[PDB]
Design an enzyme around this catalytic site. Structure first.
Site, short mmCIF file in Angstrom:
data_model
loop_
_atom_site.label_atom_id
_atom_site.label_comp_id
_atom_site.label_asym_id
_atom_site.label_seq_id
_atom_site.Cartn_x
_atom_site.Cartn_y
_atom_site.Cartn_z
N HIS A 152 0.79 -1.21 -0.08
CA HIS A 152 0.13 0.17 0.07
C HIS A 152 0.70 1.23 0.03
O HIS A 152 0.23 2.53 -0.09
CB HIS A 152 -0.93 0.07 1.13
CG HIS A 152 -0.57 0.37 2.24
ND1 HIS A 152 -0.05 -0.61 3.50
CD2 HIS A 152 -0.27 1.45 2.92
CE1 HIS A 152 0.17 0.04 4.54
NE2 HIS A 152 0.24 1.42 4.25
N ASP A 190 0.20 -7.48 1.94
CA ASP A 190 0.49 -6.26 1.90
C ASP A 190 2.04 -6.13 1.86
O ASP A 190 2.60 -5.70 3.24
CB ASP A 190 -0.04 -5.52 3.05
CG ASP A 190 0.15 -3.89 2.80
OD1 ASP A 190 0.49 -3.57 1.93
OD2 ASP A 190 -0.38 -3.33 3.82
N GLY A 220 1.70 7.24 8.79
CA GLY A 220 3.32 7.52 8.66
C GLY A 220 4.07 6.59 8.96
O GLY A 220 5.21 6.52 8.58
N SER A 244 3.42 3.22 8.26
CA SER A 244 3.23 2.33 7.05
C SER A 244 4.48 1.70 6.44
O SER A 244 5.42 2.31 6.05
CB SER A 244 2.15 2.90 6.03
OG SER A 244 0.77 2.94 6.48
N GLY A 245 4.59 0.48 6.32
CA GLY A 245 5.61 0.00 5.45
C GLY A 245 6.82 -0.42 6.29
O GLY A 245 7.80 -0.91 5.97
N1 LIG Z 1 -1.90 0.69 13.19
C1 LIG Z 1 -2.02 1.00 11.79
C2 LIG Z 1 -0.65 1.53 11.46
C3 LIG Z 1 -0.73 2.24 10.09
C4 LIG Z 1 -1.86 2.85 9.46
O1 LIG Z 1 -1.83 3.66 8.41
C5 LIG Z 1 -3.19 2.53 10.44
C6 LIG Z 1 -2.91 2.07 11.85
#
Ligand SMILES: N[C@H]1CC[C@H](O)CC1
Ligand SMILES: [Ca+2]
Length: 223
Positions: free
Chosen positions: A40, A84, A175, A177-178
Site C-alpha cells: 500500500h 501487503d 506514516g 506504514s511499511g
Molecule cells: N496501526 C496502523 C498503522 C498504520 C496505519 O495507516 C493505520 C493504523
C-alpha cells in the site's frame, strides 16, 4: 508511533524513510540493494533515505538513493490488504556500516507473546495530529491469532498478525506504514493497517513476513 519513545539517532539502522518530496512510508533494508515495505506504500518516484534520524535535517549519516524498480506482491489485494508487501530496489548499493545496516529475514515465524520493536516517523497522537521528525520506537508483543481475529472479525488472514496492547494507548499510526516489526533480530512484520491508532481492542495489524521469505529471496535472485 503512539505511546512510544525516542529511539535515539541511528539505533534502528535498518529503518528507512521512503520519500517522494516528503516522507510517506517506512521500509526495512534487507541487503545493500533492497528494501521491504508495504504494498500500500507503492507509488512512482521513490527515493530511499537511509541513516535517518531527523527526517527534516541533514545530520551527516544519511544516504539518499533513488529506487530503480518496485515489485508489489503478485497477490496483493488493496481492498483486503492481504499480501501487503513490496520490494524496492536501489539504483546503487547502500554503503553498509554501523548506522546503515540490513535486517535478517526470519527462518521461522514468531509466536504470540514474542516481544518486538516497531519503529517509524508516523503520527504520535491517537486523536489529534502531530508528526515527529526523529524516529520513534515501540516495544510490543505479538498477540494470539485468536485475539487478533476477535478484535477484527472477518478481516485477519493467514498473512497477518496483531501486535500491541488490547488496552490501547500504544500502537503504530499513520506514516508508520511499511516500516519494520523486528523480533529477536529478525524482521517478522511490516506495518500494515488498523482501525484508528492505539484504540482499545483495536491493535495494529502487520504483514506476516515469514510467509514471504521464499518470494523475497527468489525475487531478489532474478531482479
Ligand atoms: N496501526 C496502523 C498503522 C498504520 C496505519 O495507516 C493505520 C493504523
Ligand atoms: Ca536527516
Amino acid at each position: 508511533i503512539v505511546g512510544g519513545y525516542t529511539c535515539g539517532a541511528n539505533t534502528v539502522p535498518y529503518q528507512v524513510s521512503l520519500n517522494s518530496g516528503y516522507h510517506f512510508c517506512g521500509g526495512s533494508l534487507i541487503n545493500s540493494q533492497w528494501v521491504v515495505s508495504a504494498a500500500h506504500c507503492y507509488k512512482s518516484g521513490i527515493q530511499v533515505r537511509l541513516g535517518e534520524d531527523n527526517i527534516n535535517v541533514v545530520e551527516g549519516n544519511e544516504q539518499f538513493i533513488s529506487a530503480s524498480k518496485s515489485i508489489v506482491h503478485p497477490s496483493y489485494n488493496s481492498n483486503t490488504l492481504n499480501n501487503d508487501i513490496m520490494l524496492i530496489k536501489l539504483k546503487s548499493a547502500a554503503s553498509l556500516n554501523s548506522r546503515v545496516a540490513s535486517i535478517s529475514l526470519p527462518t521461522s515465524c514468531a509466536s504470540a507473546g514474542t516481544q518486538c520493536l516497531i519503529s517509524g516517523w508516523g503520527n504520535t497522537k491517537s486523536s489529534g495530529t502531530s508528526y515527529p521528525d526523529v524516529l520513534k520506537c515501540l516495544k510490543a508483543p505479538i498477540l494470539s491469532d485468536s485475539s487478533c481475529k476477535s478484535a477484527y472479525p472477518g478481516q485477519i488472514t493467514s498473512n497477518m498478525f496483531c501486535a500491541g496492547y488490547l488496552e490501547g494507548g500504544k500502537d503504530s499510526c499513520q506514516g508508520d506504514s511499511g516500516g519494520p516489526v523486528v523480533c529477536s533480530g529478525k524482521l517478522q512484520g511490516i506495518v500494515s493497517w488498523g482501525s484508528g491508532c492505539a484504540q482499545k481492542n483495536k491493535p495494529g495489524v502487520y504483514t506476516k513476513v515469514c510467509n514471504y521469505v521464499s518470494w523475497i529471496k527468489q525475487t531478489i535472485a532474478s531482479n
